[PDB]
Design a protein around this ligand. Structure first.
Ligand SMILES: [Pt+2]
Ligand SMILES: [Pt+2]
Length: 129
């Protein structure tokens, strides 16, 4: 599923991402935009053989099990395929784990490069939330 900007903001806000670990909702929408272009089915293979999954491009080396990333961990205790569902519950819960891990949203490179320091509030401007 490809979310509408405001639609995703609302879903994220209902799943408790609004100001989670001090990151306002705009940050998470911005990150999703540049990680996946709001597409829940987005996948990307990394040069190290790991793969990134879903709206938030969560990596199989650490966070999910895809059964072909050797030596990896599965810190969220889920199959990576769960992260491609249209229901974003799995992704959100895993992201909360990730962001609490100590690097905050810097874990997400697109956030760091493209959202950090910007007017992220623009991303939720004119939404009914
Ligand atoms: Pt939901
Ligand atoms: Pt939830």
């Amino acid at each position: 599923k490809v979310f509408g900007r405001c639609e995703l903001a609302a879903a994220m806000k209902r799943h408790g991402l609004d100001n989670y670990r001090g990151y306002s909702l705009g940050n998470w929408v911005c990150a999703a935009k540049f990680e996946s272009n709001f597409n829940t089915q987005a996948t990307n293979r990394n040069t190290d053989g790991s793969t990134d999954y879903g709206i938030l491009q969560i990596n199989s080396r650490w966070w999910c099990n895809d059964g072909r990333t050797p030596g990896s961990r599965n810190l969220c205790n889920i199959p990576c395929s769960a992260l491609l569902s249209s229901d974003i519950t799995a992704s959100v819960n895993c992201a909360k784990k990730i962001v609490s891990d100590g690097n905050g949203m810097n874990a997400w490179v697109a956030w760091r490069n493209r959202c950090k320091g910007t007017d992220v509030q623009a991303w939720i401007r004119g939404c009914r939330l």
